[PDB]
Structure 1
Amino acid sequence: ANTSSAYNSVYDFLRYHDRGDGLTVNGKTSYSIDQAAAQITRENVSWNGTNVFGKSANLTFKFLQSVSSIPSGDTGFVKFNAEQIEQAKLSLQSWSDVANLTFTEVTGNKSANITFGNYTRDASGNLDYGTQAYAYYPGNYQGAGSSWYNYNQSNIRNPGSEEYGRQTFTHAIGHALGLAHPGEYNAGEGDPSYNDAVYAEDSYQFSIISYWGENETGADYNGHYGGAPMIDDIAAIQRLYGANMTTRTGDSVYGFNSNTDRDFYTATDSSKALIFSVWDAGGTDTFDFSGYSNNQRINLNEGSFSDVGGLKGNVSIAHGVTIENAIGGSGNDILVGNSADNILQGGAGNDVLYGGAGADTLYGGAGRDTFVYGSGQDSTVAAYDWIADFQKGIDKIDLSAFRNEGQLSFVQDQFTGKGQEVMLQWDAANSITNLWLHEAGHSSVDFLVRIVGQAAQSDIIV
């Protein structure tokens, strides 16, 4: 049916970066999260051995202070500096947050599963200012789990201020845990490019084990590097070691006002870029994106991507995660809930809110806001939505999606029985307006949105 542009914007955003299911994207086969995860783990190796899946591990790590040799043949060893140590520990933590891994530092002569060191020259003893980093897969051989970084790169020496350095630590540790590049390519071997990718979603938007920029898949991080595991990385590492169900099991806030004590989930002011895929194992959680003025699009569905703070495709939610609440900023935003009971706050600006299934509580904020309903299942009597700050003559409630079963008619105080009728009923004692919809094919009146405030018939879009 002809539906409104507000509904169409929800319908489209729900399908942003659709994947898998026999789609073709960028002329390549599109993989699901799980297909991408299987591809990233295709070497079938982990610290637990070969072809061992879903098994936790307790691992050691060490910052080498000297070496007998570097397993690649590079030379000019330099130990990690203090900033590299701090950032590497943050990278390790970002992996142990999502998978069932513990990391324990060892020093002195103790062997370690994962090691860190820098190099500066090739096997011929000439300075190497061109390469970046590499690491070795788990195994029982000499050098297994070791990771190596070019100290002549400023991003490697300064990973706390040069985002690519922190990303590189996360990437290399991923190899040291058993993850592979999503395609058969490597640095030094020819000149690969995204054109050589096996599947469309081989980019930083989905995996920081990729070589390819997030622009290759239509995302845009405005020159930033995220630094922590992205959505397919989380699925991949959980395939090997199991998911960590102890992480952030309380009510967690991501974005502004964050309580995660993780830099990559925290924006401290509006100039801060956020790039993350969230893992969260319990509790009632909030995406607080309130500090931005850009028009944002925020989706709470697991697996989905959001456009946050002026970037594109920079936030996603890992498979297995339920995030319950979202707060937009002063821009004109779209906030899309999931089947849970969501509290959505549009903030200032003219926002479109869609609770989806479940009993949602919606605040448009200042501005001309639109609360969208796509199905009778979005607001059943048994689990109805509240719209708590509705402004008569300014906000709108959009029922245009119901046109697909016949144009809805407005009735004043009684239903005829014909169905596809909408009624507003004012409760003067409580100052509540109940919006009732008797839907085609329903014998009883089964859709209700309760509104804290008055509403006019002309505020209801049918």
Structure 2
Amino acid sequence: NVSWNGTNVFGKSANLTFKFLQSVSSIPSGDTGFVKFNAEQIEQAKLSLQSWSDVANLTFTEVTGNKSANITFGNYTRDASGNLDYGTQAYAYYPGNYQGAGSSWYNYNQSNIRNPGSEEYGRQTFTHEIGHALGLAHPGYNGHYGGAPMIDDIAAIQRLYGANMTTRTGDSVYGFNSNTDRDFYTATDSSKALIFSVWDAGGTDTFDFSGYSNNQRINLNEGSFSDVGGLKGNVSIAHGVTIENAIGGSGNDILVGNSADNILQGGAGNDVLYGGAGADTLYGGAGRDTFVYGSGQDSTVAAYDWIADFQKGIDKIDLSAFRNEGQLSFVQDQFTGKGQEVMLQWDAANSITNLWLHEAGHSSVDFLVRIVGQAAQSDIIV
């Protein structure tokens, strides 16, 4: 384990310098045909640096002239023999006191290296190379490449330098309508693929994947992967992060909440929404949607779910998981005391239906889902 703070030093922040070499006396690998970074490479490299300082306690300060720097950037074009090299991609050196430590080198004969802003592999290479120059041993979708640190990278880099708890501490939106000002978290139209692992240090946050028509599986659980915009496992939530809300697209989606209070919106299409623990607010959207409950703890009276757009005769509430302790019986207007009974109660004054479930072994009625609108017995799956 190595970092800029030494060997086997963990959770210690670092202030680092970086530099775009304008010339060299030699490249530590023995490669030759040095070429300085172009303007696009410079911009993309800074975006890559930013994606690291976003998640860990690192600061990056550019230096110029003859000042030495922790991390350097430069291109090569030829091997030690002086022959053109159009095969290799890039490499970098660990932190340390040795010559060329922290330096990173990229093959200028590769179009993706010259145009990292328009050729995604280039940006990803910058991110990986910087990762290694920071001390990561092994940094790192329909032909697309994620440009920012992924879930294991984030864990590892935070292990070395500590987690950055000042990042996006307000209410953050990831995906469409993003307010992150990060290209890798932002989708501008339905053709934009998303590949990211979200680091977020506070506030009430939303996964807005409303612009896609693919069937999506969206999971708000810390450390879990989602299938977004027709890709698979392209989105994840870093360890230590709580995302609260999620918006599906026009496809038939699955939205899985976490233990926090979640606002879930299915959008058009036939969606499956699962609030999990906590007081969730669920919008099925247009289409035939199913609201799933997996245990009594999902919607206690002290912290009940709201289903805000239920469509009688169209949507479903799924209580089949309660079978495991005796199948539920529907009662019209009164419980017997026997338990495992479900009642729908219409509040005419407010136009609210209260779904009450008296669970086996409970002295009181402890399960409640409040519904804005009417619901029928045949809307409930037991």
SS at match of 1:59: strand
| Aligned mates of 1:351, 1:263 — CA distance in 2 | 28
SS at match of 1:155: helix
The structure carrying a bigger strand percent of its residues is: 2
TM-score (norm 1): 0.82
Aligned residues: 380
Which residue pairs with 1:385 in the alignment?
A: 305
| Aligned mates of 1:104, 1:436 — CA distance in 2 | 59
Q: Shift of residue 441 of structure 1? A: 1.0
Q: Provide the identity percentage.
A: 100
Deviations for 1:196-228, whole angstroms, at most 9, x for unmatched residues? xxxxxxxxxxxxxxxxxxxxxxxxx00000111
2:242 to 297, 311, 322: 322
| Aligned mates of 1:442, 1:128 — CA distance in 2 | 74
Deviations for 1:411-453, whole angstroms, at most 9, x for unmatched residues? 0000000110000000000000000000011111000000000
In the TM superposition, what are the counterparts of 1:17-96 in structure 2 within 5 Å? 44-96=1-53
TM-score (norm 2): 0.99
Deviations for 1:295-338, whole angstroms, at most 9, x for unmatched residues? 00000000000000000000000000000000000000000000
Larger relative contact order (Cα-Cα within 8 Å, sequence gap ≥ 6): 1
SS at match of 1:87: helix
Deviations for 1:28-54, whole angstroms, at most 9, x for unmatched residues? xxxxxxxxxxxxxxxx10000011001
Q: Segments of 4+ in structure 1 off by > 6 A? A: none
Deviations for 1:6-26, whole angstroms, at most 9, x for unmatched residues? xxxxxxxxxxxxxxxxxxxxx
| Aligned mates of 1:258, 1:227 — CA distance in 2 | 17
Q: Shift of residue 86 of structure 1? A: 0.4
SS at match of 1:383: coil
Q: Shift of residue 258 of structure 1? A: 0.1
Deviations for 1:151-183, whole angstroms, at most 9, x for unmatched residues? 0000000000000000000000000000012xx
Q: Shift of residue 459 of structure 1? A: 0.0
| Aligned mates of 1:114, 1:260 — CA distance in 2 | 26
| Aligned mates of 1:278, 1:51 — CA distance in 2 | 27
1:430 aligns with 2:363: no
Deviations for 1:392-412, whole angstroms, at most 9, x for unmatched residues? 000000000000111000000
Deviations for 1:44-68, whole angstroms, at most 9, x for unmatched residues? 1000001100100000000000001
SS at match of 1:381: coil
| Aligned mates of 2:225, 2:132 — CA distance in 1 | 25
Q: Shift of residue 127 of structure 1? A: 0.5
- In structure 2, runs of 5+ residues without a counterpart are none
| Aligned mates of 2:53, 2:320 — CA distance in 1 | 46
| Aligned mates of 1:416, 1:428 — CA distance in 2 | 24
- In structure 1, runs of 5+ residues without a counterpart are 1-43, 182-220
| Aligned mates of 2:362, 2:219 — CA distance in 1 | 30
| Aligned mates of 1:457, 1:52 — CA distance in 2 | 61
| Aligned mates of 2:325, 2:52 — CA distance in 1 | 48
Which residue pairs with 2:338 in the alignment?
A: 418
| Aligned mates of 2:208, 2:255 — CA distance in 1 | 12
| Aligned mates of 1:332, 1:77 — CA distance in 2 | 52
| Aligned mates of 1:50, 1:273 — CA distance in 2 | 38
Deviations for 1:114-156, whole angstroms, at most 9, x for unmatched residues? 0000000001100000000000000001100000000000000
1:286 aligns with 2:206: yes
SS at match of 1:126: coil
SS at match of 2:354: strand
| Aligned mates of 1:70, 1:384 — CA distance in 2 | 64
Q: Shift of residue 358 of structure 1? A: 0.2
The alignment's C-alpha RMSD in Å is 0.3
Which residue pairs with 1:222 in the alignment?
A: 142
Q: Shift of residue 353 of structure 1? A: 0.2
| Aligned mates of 2:67, 2:337 — CA distance in 1 | 79
2:371 to 451, 455, 458: 451
Which residue pairs with 1:334 in the alignment?
A: 254
In the TM superposition, what are the counterparts of 1:221-300 in structure 2 within 5 Å? 221-300=141-220
